[PDB]
Amino acid sequence: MFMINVLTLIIPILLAVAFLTLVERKVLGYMQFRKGPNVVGPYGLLQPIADAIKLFIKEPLRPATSSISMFILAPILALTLALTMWIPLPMPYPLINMNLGVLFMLAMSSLAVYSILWSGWASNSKYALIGALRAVAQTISYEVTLAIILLSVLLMNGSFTLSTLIITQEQVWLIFPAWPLAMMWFISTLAETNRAPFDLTEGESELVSGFNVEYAAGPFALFFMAEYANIIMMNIFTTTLFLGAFHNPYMPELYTINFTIKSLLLSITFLWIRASYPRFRYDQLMHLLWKNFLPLTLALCMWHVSLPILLSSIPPQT
């Protein structure tokens, strides 16, 4: 039955990604004053099903300078790790109650970065090379500030376990003891998610989608589903991490309702941020990241060191 629980985690991620592509296209259409998919049956749904089926038709092809092992083993690591992030997520009681999950979040997100990098390398067509190096750039920028802001926000109340984290999210939301740290965290995760050209330089119009400019049409489903799992993934991690829900004891469905509605409203907020801002810039990303975030983050870190040592508000980190 444990296998049944694993299957009931890896089945709704498929449906989540496909119907979220529907959501992206139609919300973005009504965002940009036009109309979304409407002719295809009831409003869209069977056409995103047809998108998945159509992309499985496409019969992909290997390039010349395209070492087969690295080539077809890159997006496998992408999709598998974009899944296996979802193990310690505390949808009301998580799949595996690990004693720490957030450094695991860090490591598996970095694995998603490496899989993007290896696909952009072994595509071996110079545009995926430029895009892979831009991905290296936005990973140099955004795997430090995210880590130290994480250290700050669980410095206050965390003790590394998500069940104690939902206990700490009880009287007030943790948006209010750390609000500008939350602003910087949301911008950093929006960068790391590699959607939202507010902080995305991989899916360019200057290049053509620097991860997989010329990959193949077959594993585009793998890559596409992996990054939208990344979107839902970090937004659910947001909706656990900062704000939350007063769960009923011995009834989790109300927690699921409040948690899911807050998470998908923040996901619509994320897509609504993607809709309206221009693309951004390599050295400006370095400039903005370091010379705007990093001293203010360190100041928040030392101030959340000094706060529970001066208010006796230290956690019961057993």
Partner 1 sequence: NVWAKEPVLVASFAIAGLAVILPTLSPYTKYSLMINRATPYNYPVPLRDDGNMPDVPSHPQDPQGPSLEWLKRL
Partner 2 sequence: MWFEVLPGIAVMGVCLFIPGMATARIHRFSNGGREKRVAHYSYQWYLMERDRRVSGVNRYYVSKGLENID
Partner 3 sequence: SRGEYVVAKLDDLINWARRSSLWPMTFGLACCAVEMMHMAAPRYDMDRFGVVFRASPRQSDVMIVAGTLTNKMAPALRKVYDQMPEPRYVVSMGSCANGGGYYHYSYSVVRGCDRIVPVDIYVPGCPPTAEALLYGILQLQKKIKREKRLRIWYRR
By CB under 8 A, is residue 51 in contact with partner 3?
Answer: yes
By CB under 8 A, is residue 64 in contact with partner 3?
Answer: no
Ramachandran angles phi, psi of 87, nearest 5°: -75, -55
Stretch that binds partner 3, among 55-63, 113-121, 151-159, 244-252 (CB under 8 A): 55-63
Structure tokens at 161: 């376990």
What is d(CA 185, CA 174) in angstroms, rounded to the nearest whole number?
13
Which of the listed partners (partner 1, partner 3, partner 2, none) does 95 bind, with a CB threshold of 5 to 8 Å by partner kind? partner 2
The binder of partner 3 chosen from 33, 249, 312, 318 (CB under 8 A)? 33
> Exposed, middle or buried, 267 (CB in 10 Å: 0-12/13-18/19+)?
buried
Q: Which is nearer to partner 3, 50 or 301 (CB)?
A: 50
Q: Is the dihedral of CA 186, 192, 196, 201 positive or negative?
A: positive
Q: Which is nearer to partner 2, 113 or 154 (CB)?
A: 154
Which residues of this chain interact with partner 1, rule CB under 8 A? 291-292, 295-296, 298-300, 302-303, 305-306, 309-312, 314, 318
Contacts 24+ apart (CB under 8 A), 101-109: 101/160, 101/161, 101/162, 102/150, 102/154, 102/158, 102/160, 103/160, 105/237, 106/143, 106/146, 106/147, 106/150, 108/81, 108/84, 109/85, 109/192, 109/230, 109/234
Residues 23-42 binding partner 2 (CB under 8 A) are: 23, 26-27, 30, 35-36, 38, 42
Which of the listed partners (partner 1, partner 2, partner 3, none) does 213 bind, with a CB threshold of 5 to 8 Å by partner kind? partner 3
The total number of residues shown for the chain amounts to 318
By CB under 8 A, is residue 45 in contact with partner 2?
Answer: yes
Which residues lie near partner 2 (CB under 8 A)? 1, 4-5, 8-9, 12, 15-16, 19-20, 22-23, 26-27, 30, 35-36, 38, 42-45, 91-95, 97, 99, 161, 163, 232, 252-253, 255-257, 259-261, 263-264, 268, 318
